[PDB]
Motif scaffolding. Structure first.
Motif, PDB file in Angstrom:
ATOM      1  N   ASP A 179       0.988  -1.721  -0.053  1.00  0.00           N
ATOM      2  CA  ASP A 179      -0.165  -0.029   0.020  1.00  0.00           C
ATOM      3  C   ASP A 179       0.766   1.635   0.196  1.00  0.00           C
ATOM      4  OD1 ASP A 179      -2.420  -1.145  -0.303  1.00  0.00           O
ATOM      5  OD2 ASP A 179      -2.661  -1.931   2.126  1.00  0.00           O
ATOM      6  N   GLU A 180       2.148   1.387   0.300  1.00  0.00           N
ATOM      7  CA  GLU A 180       2.641   2.023   0.502  1.00  0.00           C
ATOM      8  C   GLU A 180       3.084   3.201  -1.393  1.00  0.00           C
ATOM      9  OE1 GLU A 180       6.985   1.605   2.557  1.00  0.00           O
ATOM     10  OE2 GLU A 180       7.717   3.919   1.644  1.00  0.00           O
ATOM     11  N   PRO A 183       1.255   6.726  -0.678  1.00  0.00           N
ATOM     12  CA  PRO A 183       1.496   7.232   0.242  1.00  0.00           C
ATOM     13  C   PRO A 183      -0.230   8.578   0.911  1.00  0.00           C
ATOM     14  CG  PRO A 183       3.212   7.138  -1.087  1.00  0.00           C
ATOM     15  CD  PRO A 183       2.130   7.009  -1.933  1.00  0.00           C
ATOM     16  N   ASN A 221      -0.538   4.673   4.730  1.00  0.00           N
ATOM     17  CA  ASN A 221      -0.777   4.689   2.619  1.00  0.00           C
ATOM     18  C   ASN A 221      -2.031   4.744   3.298  1.00  0.00           C
ATOM     19  OD1 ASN A 221       1.684   2.188   3.774  1.00  0.00           O
ATOM     20  ND2 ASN A 221       2.102   4.483   2.612  1.00  0.00           N
TER      21      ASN A 221
END
Ligand code: HEM
Ligand code: HEM
Ligand SMILES: [Cl-]
Ligand SMILES: [Cl-]
Ligand SMILES: [Cl-]
Ligand SMILES: [Cl-]
Ligand SMILES: [Cl-]
Ligand SMILES: [Cl-]
Ligand code: NA
Ligand code: NA
Lengths: 480, 480, 480, 480
Positions: A179-180, A183, A221
């Motif tokens: 999920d990074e 951001p 995130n």
């Protein structure tokens, strides 16, 4: 109270009506205010950045906590408490100006330090590695990720064709599809120098260095669903958030850490420490605090300051040098090159790009010469003691070359899969699920053969990783 | 099978590795393929359009159903069944290239007809009127609508300040804040010439003309909530939909109608028939069918054909002329002026912009001269019978001027509110509710004094219109 | 003592040697100082002016001797003793930069006055008339006079073809082929406004005006042989002379005179007073002294100040307006148009082009924005009392239109030959001999038919004129 | 017979008269033909070349007499009788476009071979050596030779300051101040590759090579006095002479010779064989005939073909490679870099610059994209067999690097004076007198200290040389 004027400084009599044949007739050519005003309007736009076109800027200050002089002669790092002004631009990567800040992408994290020995630009991203290791591939990679040249829409079948045939991408994809890859905003975000650089001290001794920025706000995130809910109502949410934090006095900050590595540690690692598809172990090369950067001032004009901002990884200062990283080596060229096209030959005179340190040299002319040059002497050597001269206290180091020929050849120990597997296993179960989910939604429409190659690459990284992805895509991998 | 080559035509030996000092050393300057490939990459982007930057293109054909020769000598309209190739670009207006197609905005509807007497561009929008009536105001209006020059975010307080102090905008805002402010896509969408033009027949007789495009697919619009739900998952849905229809053989079409009005009707009206804030009654000036345009072909390359497409309202052909409309008059200048900057002096040689008709004249040189010129004679008059000459069969009309001086003065009978009230009352109750809802969400955060002026302007249009808006904004207007 | 630096402000360690693989090996890409220094070198040049490319500049002062307020409200002319700074560029016309100043050609005489109500440019030549009377012909004219587009050498057969088929040129050729076609230098030289302009006084009354500059140094000219002898030893003699006079304190000066003519005098003259192929009789419209301009300062940098200087006849100040002259009318457009291309959209911010009077307006952005803009408000009307507003004290006049219709039609009373005859007869016998000599050497190689047409045109000017030319060219014209 | 048209392909009704308010009133903005025609006129000019701005072009053929395949795999040299089309530009160096061809200067001799394996550009001069040996000094050298940035006149005090402090210039000044500093024209002129290059054969064996062009017409020069006599009457005499020879069928030709040297001869010499201030002995490395180039065709348009011509030493073909020469190494970069600025990102598509060999690659877009691109695939690697791929038969050689560090350091054995002394002694007495005469006239006005240093440099070359120059300048050098 002020007059509206033309650019000649003549007060405008009427800023509402064109000049015409009576009150309703056609318009006259002798209407200098109309034509001047329209002609400048018609010329407001300049080319956007070739990548990282969507972004936002802010000014701030960097303060040293621990002087770094044992390892680098860099002036801005030389004493505890030393403050250096910065300008920073944060960005997405692939889509144009105007595109949403809720899309999956690395984020740019570019910092310009206005040092007493010149401007130093550290042109980072949030994620700490890259997809490729040689700059020759960069237009290919970008062209595959960018919207299709016929349809103007991004097509996963195109970038996954490229990435799969470029297995060095496997580590980076393993970060970007966590999920990074999205951001929450620019403040709650990691920063990284990505490359290894060289730090060189007053004695001429050299270490390899990596840079890391740690957000005071923490890392946060967005899931694909969280991103869609934001995207529904705001396609510039991160730009908005940065501006609003600063306007409210809630200044975001990042602590700067470094890792340092002896040149001699090359020979005993199972990867090339200058391969930008690799990180260095934080157990083996611990993070060392340097200082803190606080962003506290919004620009006064977005076009003049943020759109025109020019960073380059080749804006290095004494004590900080490139490494041999082949990706970095191309960036040294590409940035000032694109900037001359985007901004003009004299782009370094645009205020946000100007150094605080003196500039004296024998360059001249070029489009939009606005600096009021003077003097007869624009060449060196010359017979005049007062004219600018070279200064041998500011020579760069002389790196040792291990190669004996001019070659086109991949680095030794590419090790394409190992760190991808290590990153996979470092994920929590919840993080592993998100990675598989995000990869699956991206891969499910792509050409079957390319889909299979992707699965194979991730399987070489880690068997569980690859098997889970295969299962989730409904691909049977038994015959392999 | 083909070699990858440099632009010099030399086959490339290795398209993966930079040239370096051994397999891991720094990069050499003598790597022409790297530098050429990076430098061209670094130069890919050109300035986007100053307005209507986000858009999509298609090719097709226009066929005449009813010859128009009694009213215009235009060649492309001269006979039943006559087919003319077109190129068409559709667009939003305010935000940059990568911006969503779910935002409120007029939509561009630009048609280039490749006629046997030259290219004719009809540069329309979906909505049939405009916010302003003089081109001197256009940079003001656009600057107010555009993202704030500090924050890079659009601000209703800015554009409502301008619009409220520009009450001629009141009719337009009454259309744009219906749900027609957000067309569902480019196919299910109205088209309009907006301006009155002049049609001139073989006898030199002139009528005023307006153009209307009626979609075969019908008109469909989005509520604010419908637009948000699409925006969540696709910021390029209208570009996608156009391409996809055409790829599937589901070609969208529009029928072209005109209204025609004698020049002498000027005095019979309570508005100026060349005021682009005005429509003409379809009861009094009925729609007359001309033909049908069908879009059946996607471009081969989006950048070369769609991004580089150049249209101008001054690309008129014999039998079709500008009117005295002061807004139109500025456009005649601004398009080719902006195009010279955006695309280069020789932008008319870009393939999509080229006429089908022969081009011969004494212009020369300019950046990127690719057309293989020849000949000694680049001036006229000249003594050579074979060189190009003027042709008096193609003179334009000589419009009568009623004014006796060069003036800067608003038209008479501005009548800023009457047609806005008429449009309001023409709405269904469901439509009136959507208008109020959409206005309210836009106005509720703006400066109170500006808010009140907006209410006042709409109240002058229609009492019920203004009172409903006031009630919905919680503004008490008793005592005005 | 000063360091040589990069444009990043980093001191340069070595300005002699490139970075290489040992002392003799190939060069590295990581050499920021080499690349930056070469890349800027590579971009030094901008396009030269399309005409008047060869020239030289100087600064100075204009002082009023006789206030002109009876006739014009212009501020710079309002009071005895009033001093206004100027910049002036003198030039040849046809050949490129680098070409000799010994060639036959009008000379440019362009003056920028930095007035308290804005910059006023008077963009004159030494000779007081022109070859043509409509700007539509200006590219044709120039292309005929310019070097042939195949051979790159100027060809009399080409420009005499155009001129002879453009008989309005006959007066101008009668002056240009006196020895005043080749002024000795820029100081010992006439200046002229050429066009009639309109002067408008505090009561709104208008007169026609012509400007004349009379050299303090007297007028001196070169024969063809004198010109060749200079050309042998100095191809930049007039640039050298202007610089040298100023450096040694021998400042050149010109007295400014005007002629003034009632508008009403149109109807009783046998020529159009706004035909720039015409002069006004100095008996009937006497010269009236205005003041004196003295040039006393050389520029500090030739590229930044003289090459980048931008003048326009549309840089008019209150009290001074265009006339209806159709040649002038095109100039109003062409100069700022060319300058946007040549110098950039922000060319008015280049120091030499900046007004002394304040500039405030809502224009923004464009290539090389260097001015540190700020503020949210870049649109008008707006609610803010402090932002710039129009000022109705500074409206232009409203010239009466005598025409009914939008037409393309030659002016009435063209009278192409009369004044050319009068000028001929005004010449001393020596002057008449030089004219014939210089015409003969130019015409003797041209196409016989064009040669005969030239003779005819001059014979219509004056019988003796034409007969002498015919005799000198060996052409028997008895049968005509 | 043809219609004059606009760029939209609309026939022009009137190419004489602007559109105006009656036959004498002011001009209307709605005159598309006027504005279009003026706006293109206003954009004709592009930047001239930063050096070598004054020149002339021709086409021809090169034919092989002796195949070179023992020493190079270059395709165009592979068989006896093989013909290759060429384009050639000759030039002066320092002054701008319109400057005389009678000035002292090296002459450019640039040959573009359109080979079956790509374009090969050999960018030579007439003289066989250069003033400097590292490209870092090139903007310094040029700025010193160019007209002074204040006065716009060339100043010997400025370039002699630089050259005297740059003693490596001494050999070149010894050739340039012979009367060969002023070739009689472009035909009667030497040509030289100047640099050592590398030839590589099909077995991968490498030799150093030098190129020499020997005029069929012989070498002929002008004295200072001969040059002045020509300059008096013609400032484009060499441009004229080249065109005229070709138009009359008197085609000029040059025989191409080479010298070849083993790489292993480096240690056998007392100079660096890749120092471009050095020649190689024709006794020790004899001239070997290759073939003959004949120029037989003038261009059809000087701007499109000669002015827009783009050459680069980095346009190398298989079998021909750069040497390590540090001056050459910078040129590899500077030419395409300056051309992108001068001509646009797509300058390689300008017809004269196009290869005969096929071009396929994944570059895209850029200003003035005129080539009708197509396809979805603009990246490699990709999964499609039919898309362009690299070809390992066309790899370059892998030169051995003798250095172990990245350094900024002068070559060993600079030997700045020896070959100057050898050239001096090789001159006839008549040739020695001309050299002294020309140097004396150039040096007599320069700063005394600089004058003395020049004498010292030439005295180190040869005692007699220096003493004669000192005697002729009246400088007493006994104390030294
Ligand atoms: C071959 C590899 C790469 C090439 C060729 C490349 C090239 C470029 C170019 C041409 C630009 C536009 C610059 C401008 O117009 O001012 C750019 C912007 C940018 N690049 Fe890269 N890049 C590369 C790799 C990377 C990497 C590894 C990072 C991070 C480490 C990165 C971060 C950025 C950022 C943050 C920007 C935007 C700077 C700004 O805010 O203006 N790039 N790059
Ligand atoms: C239709 C007529 C004309 C057109 C279309 C025209 C156009 C131009 C253009 C485009 C330039 C280059 C300007 C620049 O790059 O700054 C120029 C320069 C110039 N023209 Fe004209 N011109 C015209 C007539 C004249 C006339 C009548 C005069 C004098 C009466 C004149 C005097 C000059 C001078 C002195 C310059 C040089 C400006 C400088 O010193 O920088 N021109 N002209
Ligand atoms: Cl560029
Ligand atoms: Cl420098
Ligand atoms: Cl034309
Ligand atoms: Cl432009
Ligand atoms: Cl404004
Ligand atoms: Cl490629
Ligand atoms: Na410390
Ligand atoms: Na052979």
């Amino acid at each position: 109270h002020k007059n509206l004027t033309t650019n000649q400084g003549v007060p405008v009599g009427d800023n509402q009506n064109s000049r015409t044949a009576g009150h309703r007739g056609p318009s006259f050519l002798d209407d200098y205010h109309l034509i001047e005003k329209l002609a400048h309007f018609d010329r407001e736009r300049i080319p956007e950045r070739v990548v990282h076109a969507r972004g936002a800027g802010a000014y701030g200050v960097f303060e040293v906590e621990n002087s770094m002089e044992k390892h680098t002669r860099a002036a801005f790092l030389s004493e505890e408490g030393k403050q250096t002004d910065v300008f920073v631009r944060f960005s997405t990567v692939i889509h144009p100006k105007g595109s949403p800040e809720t899309l999956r992408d690395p984020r740019g994290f570019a910092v310009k330090f206005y040092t007493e020995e010149g401007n130093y630009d550290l042109v980072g991203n949030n994620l700490p590695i890259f997809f490729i290791r040689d700059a020759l591939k960069f237009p290919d990679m970008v062209h595959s990720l960018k919207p299709d040249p016929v349809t103007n829409i991004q097509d996963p079948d195109r970038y996954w064709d490229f990435m799969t045939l470029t297995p060095e991408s496997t580590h980076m994809l393993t970060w970007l599809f966590s999920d990074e890859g999205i951001p929450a905003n620019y403040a709650e975000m990691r920063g990284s120098g990505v490359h290894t650089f060289r730090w060189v001290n007053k004695y001429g001794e050299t270490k390899y260095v990596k840079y890391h920025w740690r957000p005071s706000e923490g890392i946060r995130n967005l899931s694909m669903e969280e991103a869609a809910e934001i995207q529904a109502n705001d396609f510039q949410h991160a730009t908005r958030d940065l501006y609003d934090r600063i306007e409210k006095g809630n200044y975001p900050a990042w602590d700067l850490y470094v890792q340092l590595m002896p040149l001699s540690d090359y020979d005993e690692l199972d990867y090339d420490p200058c391969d930008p598809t690799k990180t260095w172990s934080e157990e083996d090369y611990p993070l060392q605090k340097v200082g803190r950067m606080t962003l506290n001032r919004n620009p006064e004009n977005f076009f003049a300051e943020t759109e025109q901002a020019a960073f380059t990884p080749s804006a290095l200062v004494p004590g900080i040098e490139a490494s041999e990283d082949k990706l970095l080596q191309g960036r040294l060229f590409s940035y000032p090159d694109t900037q001359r096209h985007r901004l003009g030959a004299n782009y370094m005179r645009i205020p946000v790009n100007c150094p605080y340190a003196p500039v004296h040299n024998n360059q001249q002319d070029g489009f939009m010469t606005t600096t009021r040059p003077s003097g007869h002497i624009n060449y060196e050597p010359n017979r005049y003691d007062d004219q600018p001269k070279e200064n041998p206290h500011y020579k760069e180091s002389e790196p040792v070359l291990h190669g004996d020929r001019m070659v086109r050849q991949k680095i030794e120990k590419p090790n394409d899969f190992k760190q991808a597997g290590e990153k996979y296993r470092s994920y929590s179960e919840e993080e592993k699920q998100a990675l598989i989910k995000n990869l699956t939604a991206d891969l499910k429409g792509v050409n079957e053969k390319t889909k299979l190659l992707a699965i194979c690459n991730f399987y070489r990284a880690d068997e569980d990783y690859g098997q889970r992805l295969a299962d989730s895509l409904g691909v049977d991998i038994r015959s392999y």
